[PDB]
Amino acid sequence: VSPPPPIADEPLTVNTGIYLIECYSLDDKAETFKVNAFLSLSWKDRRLAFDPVRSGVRVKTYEPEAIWIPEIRFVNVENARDADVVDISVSPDGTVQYLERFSARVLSPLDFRRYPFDSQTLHIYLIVRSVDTRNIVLAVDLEKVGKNDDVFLTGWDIESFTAVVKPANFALEDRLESKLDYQLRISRQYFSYIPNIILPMLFILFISWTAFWSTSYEANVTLVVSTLIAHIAFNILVETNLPKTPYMTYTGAIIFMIYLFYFVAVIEVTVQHYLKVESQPARAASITRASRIAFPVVFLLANIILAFLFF
Amino acid sequence: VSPPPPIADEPLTVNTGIYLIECYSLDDKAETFKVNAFLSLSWKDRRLAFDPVRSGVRVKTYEPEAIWIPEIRFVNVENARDADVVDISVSPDGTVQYLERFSARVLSPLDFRRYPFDSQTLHIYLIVRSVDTRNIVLAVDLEKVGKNDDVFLTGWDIESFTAVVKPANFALEDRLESKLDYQLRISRQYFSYIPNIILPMLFILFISWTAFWSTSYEANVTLVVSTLIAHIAFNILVETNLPKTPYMTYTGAIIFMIYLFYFVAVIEVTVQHYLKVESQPARAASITRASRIAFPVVFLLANIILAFLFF
Amino acid sequence: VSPPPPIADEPLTVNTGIYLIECYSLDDKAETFKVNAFLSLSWKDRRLAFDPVRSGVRVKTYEPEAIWIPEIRFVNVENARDADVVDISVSPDGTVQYLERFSARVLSPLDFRRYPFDSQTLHIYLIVRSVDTRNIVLAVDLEKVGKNDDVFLTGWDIESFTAVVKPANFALEDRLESKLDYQLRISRQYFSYIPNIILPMLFILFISWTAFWSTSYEANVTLVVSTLIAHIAFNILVETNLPKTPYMTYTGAIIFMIYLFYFVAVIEVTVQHYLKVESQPARAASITRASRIAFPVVFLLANIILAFLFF
Amino acid sequence: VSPPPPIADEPLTVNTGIYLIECYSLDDKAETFKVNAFLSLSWKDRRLAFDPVRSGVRVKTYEPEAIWIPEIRFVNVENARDADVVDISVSPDGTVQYLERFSARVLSPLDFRRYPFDSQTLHIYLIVRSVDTRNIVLAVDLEKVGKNDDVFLTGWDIESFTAVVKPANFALEDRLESKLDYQLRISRQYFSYIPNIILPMLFILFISWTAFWSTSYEANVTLVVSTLIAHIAFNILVETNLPKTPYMTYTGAIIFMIYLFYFVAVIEVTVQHYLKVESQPARAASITRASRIAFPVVFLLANIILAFLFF
Amino acid sequence: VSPPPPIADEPLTVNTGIYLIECYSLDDKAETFKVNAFLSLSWKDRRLAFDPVRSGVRVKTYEPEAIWIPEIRFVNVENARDADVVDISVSPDGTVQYLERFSARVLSPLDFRRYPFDSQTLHIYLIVRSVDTRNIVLAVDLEKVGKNDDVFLTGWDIESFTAVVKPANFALEDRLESKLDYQLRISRQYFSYIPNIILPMLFILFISWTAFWSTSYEANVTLVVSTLIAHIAFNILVETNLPKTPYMTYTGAIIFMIYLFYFVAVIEVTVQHYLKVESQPARAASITRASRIAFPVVFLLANIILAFLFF
Ligand SMILES: [Cl-]
Ligand SMILES: [Cl-]
Ligand SMILES: [Cl-]
Ligand SMILES: [Cl-]
Ligand SMILES: [Cl-]
Ligand SMILES: [Cl-]
Ligand SMILES: [Cl-]
Ligand code: NA
Ligand code: NA
Ligand code: NA
Ligand code: NA
Ligand code: NA
Ligand code: NA
């Protein structure tokens, strides 16, 4: 059990395929997902060639230990995949058809810039390391790349599962490495974010703006401070669902901007009271009346600017 | 150790059975459940046939390694099941009776639309992949399908555990696949949701409506804003128990609608105060008196409409 | 390696014993506990009988693989126990003395009705399945049933660890099954619940009742609404430490009833205000004075009724 | 592979040693800690005697399976330790020097009475069970007992790692058991508790006492009720870090006592208002002035009494 | 299979290399990180030397079991690494080139003093224990030390991955131990802390300072007490992300100091009210006007002092 020797000096081509059975546990904080799939491998081993007329069989079945099998690994995994060999079939010319079913936890970075209206390209990198005897190169058998219809990733829509057919061949620790990129294109189901986070957050913000139709400082203080505390609750809830990013997320920007609106509303409420106490409610009245238009208008404009920058 | 050869060209029938011992960890967020069960398998292998007279024994016991056993797998599992072979019995005609006890974590999607008054059909898909020598087809031995009396799934009532006797035979990667659907019908024990979430949520909403029997704006602001914060606490509690769905759930709809009622109550309280300050308490009084009837009436009607759409 | 043949048609008796070493992780929500114990097994195998005079030894030690050992399993486990064989001793008559040390996660339902003043009977079900050659029956060797003094289950008092000596013999999938019930009787250490949940919950309720010695509606609204929010915090804390039950628990009933007391106190506060505004403080005064006695009296009586129904 | 026979009737002495490499995950709630250490064992097996002149080697190296090794276990573990044999060296006289590196999760009860100014003695119990052929006794090789300088247990100071050299030899299930006690003495780093829990809790309590310099009932109600809610938040935070104890802890006692101070402050605020309303502010003034001294004095005295009882 | 004998009395040099493939799960509380890397080993075994002319091959491939391999371990790991041997190549002189891919959870203490503007040096300690036959010493092959470009540690910037080429050779349990230090230099991405924790915390503090432009005690009490509760929420959130340290962290110091600012603001608000009630609003006015400058000035100065001490 050693690699098949070359006829000339050509590398050994291992044709690959991944057929997704299950996709689950897409952890946004960890930037990981779990996969249960079929991994098909195919290569020619002339040492295994036979005459079907003399042997009586058109195909030969082998045990993994009985023959040479290329050491194929996943790059972006936590631990080595848990694999169970399904079948090893050898045709008369010595063409081997290997099939295994595996489970793995894949590390794939996510771009949260447009969260929760984001799309991701999850990667599964297949790799083989060349041996001293000969160089091993990877290929894609497009006929053996797919996913079943039942593949459901909770909170996501699956668009496509394709493979970049040209491998990335590079040298690592004085040996050739042949890498294939299997890309799973997904898009977030943003629906739930609207009644659970977005609209509740807007309702409390609009409730704080009723202080612009009130001269009662004590009630105005209760209105703006209480809704601010409710906004803090939603901010904390959102940041518990997401990892910490070295950039601003769309939701993060809106959440942050709303703090400025609460801050300016506290300033308005304070100014209005100060003037009323200073026996100038006429000045206070004009500021409060302006705020009634200014706050929703500036909020609508700032959100248009934010949506423009992010989308 | 190779599959039993056919007498004519007929496929090999592997009769199956699942007897549930334990059902636990039904995770709503993950849409998974854990199962501990017996898996029985039966097929004829004429190569194992014997005369019971000359052998002296009526039934022969074999070790898994000693004989050919079909590679049976579960489709909707996280990882391959943890199995322990209990018994392998062979009758004189060569009929094999295999029994194993296994544990597995099953992926089964849940429909939360009617939550917490929802019913679910959990699936366990048994599968076999055919070999080059012969095609393997699955069957259900109804006598070997069941569950013990002690099977308890916390927070759920188990209705039935049946099997769709006709297998789904299809081609996958140029080989026949034979799939069986084992269905576990369950209904959610909604009891606890009434004193823990539903009634507390209604009590705080009804407490906010006492503002319609008060002219004190500052007290009215405290009443409606405080109860709103308590409503947000319950909303967050509910959404931590459930996954994010691309549809509205029954509880989700009620929770969302109640925000509109708090919003309109803030509008009422603001309007009532504005008019009182504007020296028109007669206009304010008629709006407040109307609200006393309008708010409970509209709440009762909206809930009838919601219950109608969902059930 | 096959089961010992019968002398007459009698079943094979496997004497059992469980000696608890560690008891930990009693999860109320999951209704599971972890156990680390010794499992002793004893049965006669005449094929292993020897003359101690000819052999020179009065006991023979065997490796598990060298001899037939009954396939003993636990019924109510998540996964098969992790076992390490300690010793296998054979006496001249062929009596085998097997000892293993194991760890397992046991599924045992709990009755939360009297929580946190509840007692439980945890079960460990030992089982053996019969073979075609002969029927295997389980027995209890009371001398080999116990627990060490150091066995501590955090938040619980261990009363007894006994075994129901008569096995439950039944037919399952056309083979006899022999089941033994090992019962671990425990009682909850309710101490901590008094200073952590019960008294804090009563203090906030009594703080809300100070509104009956106040004519200040705005202060009364703050008192009752704030303490209600603190009561909601305790309700949520309690329901996070418990699973969802299709029945009321003692704590659950008290917690639920206290919502009614807060609701009626809001009604009182609203009524008192309304009258004091309709220029009838004399009517308001008599209602408030009555409430001072009515609220603690009805609370004390309702709690006596609740404690009576639950204990 | 059986135990070495005795020269006379003496028991077999297995010299032991534990050298700590890593100490981590001291879980207070679970009362467990994780350990990564070296376990050294030494015993004489005269059957392994060799002539170094004939063998050519002065010390023979063996594989665990090749020779008899005593079945040494830990008593207070969740599951059996994960061990990797480092070396097995045999000298000509048949003296075996065994070394393994292991990882285990140890169950060791903690005394929370003085929390967070508590010290603990973590135990690691080594045990061996005797065989029918001969009795096995444990011993401590003090030269092979220690810990590396890098051993850090987060939130704790490690004082000493010693062994009680005299084993506890007792009969269990009709065989001798030899137990050794390895004691890891640790003291909690209380530092963090002062700026994170203790001082924030005292600041909010002192903020509630500003109500004794205020005649404004509505403001006084806000002061005491709000700080009480903040106290409940800290109580919940503390009880999430600790297990439920059938005794009072130091922190638990202080936290509980502070509820009584908030309760009495609510009584004071209510009394002060009632008298002011009853046109007797002179009586109210003397009670409020007394409270200014009484509350801090009684708080300081009660804490001295508590610290005395606990330390 | 025993270690290669020395030519003279020199120790056996095992050249090492670590090439990082994945870096994930840097847990601040646990002070652990997960690593997936290549571990290369190289040493001379003259017993494996061959003539390439006679053998026909320039390199020989071996199975791990077929040859002697040094027992290399990681010091600061939870459990032994999960390793898969990739290749074992032997050159004519007997120079062995070993390569494995492993995954491990590394224990590496973190200095939180400057959090969240902190930098760390994560350590991976490689170790070998010497045998009776000969001493084994570790070395660094700098050509086989690195990391791939795709190596991403969420919330951190990776600066360098180097090795301290001189090993720490010391005696442990009467045998030589050879230790190598692989250092992974990382710096925290502080960006997210600014819009998520720092600015929200400053906004609420600045909102409390609006009480210095208000004579309304009841509104002032609401302002300062409400923002204090919001500050407590952020303190709790921060201490849930960090472990308990026996020193002050930068964030911990700022958070603690802000409590003093809220405390003094409550004192100011109380003093201002007391004087107004005592018919001296002129004294109150001068204190309030001074506070408007004093609070931001002292806050800015105290923060300059804190930043100076910490950086
Ligand atoms: Cl892999
Ligand atoms: Cl499976
Ligand atoms: Cl088991
Ligand atoms: Cl029966
Ligand atoms: Cl039977
Ligand atoms: Cl162990
Ligand atoms: Cl290791
Ligand atoms: Na191979
Ligand atoms: Na087989
Ligand atoms: Na056996
Ligand atoms: Na051995
Ligand atoms: Na208030
Ligand atoms: Na080896």
Author numbering:
A (entry chain D), B (entry chain E), C (entry chain A), D (entry chain B), E (entry chain C): 5 to 315
The authors write:
We thus aimed to check whether dicarboxylic acids are also able to bind GLIC similarly to monocarboxylates. A 2.5 Å resolution structure was obtained from crystals grown in a solution buffered at pH 4.0 using 0.1 M succinate (diC4). In this structure, two identical GLIC pentamers were found in the asymmetric unit, with a c unit-cell parameter that was twice as large as in the other structures described in this study. The succinate molecule bound in the intersubunit site is modelled with one of its carboxylate moieties superimposed on the position of acetate below Loop C. This carboxylate moiety interacts with the side chains of residues from two adjacent subunits: Arg77 (Loop A) and Glu181 (Loop C) from one subunit and Arg105 from the neighbouring subunit. The succinate molecule in the intrasubunit site displayed a higher flexibility than the intersubunit succinate, as seen in the different subunits. Indeed, the first succinate carboxylic moiety binds in the same way (in all subunits) as acetate: through a hydrogen bond to the hydroxyl group of the well conserved Tyr102 and a salt bridge to the guanidinium group of Arg85, which itself makes a salt bridge with Glu104. However, the second carboxylic moiety of the intrasubunit succinate molecule only interacts with the main-chain carbonyl group of Pro74, leading to different binding poses of succinate in the intrasubunit site in the different subunits. Unlike the intersubunit succinate, where both carboxylic groups are tightly coordinated through hydrogen bonds to Arg85, Tyr102 and Glu104, the second carboxylic group of succinate in the intrasubunit site points almost freely towards the solvent and is only loosely coordinated through a hydrogen bond to the main chain of Pro74 in most of the modelled succinate poses.
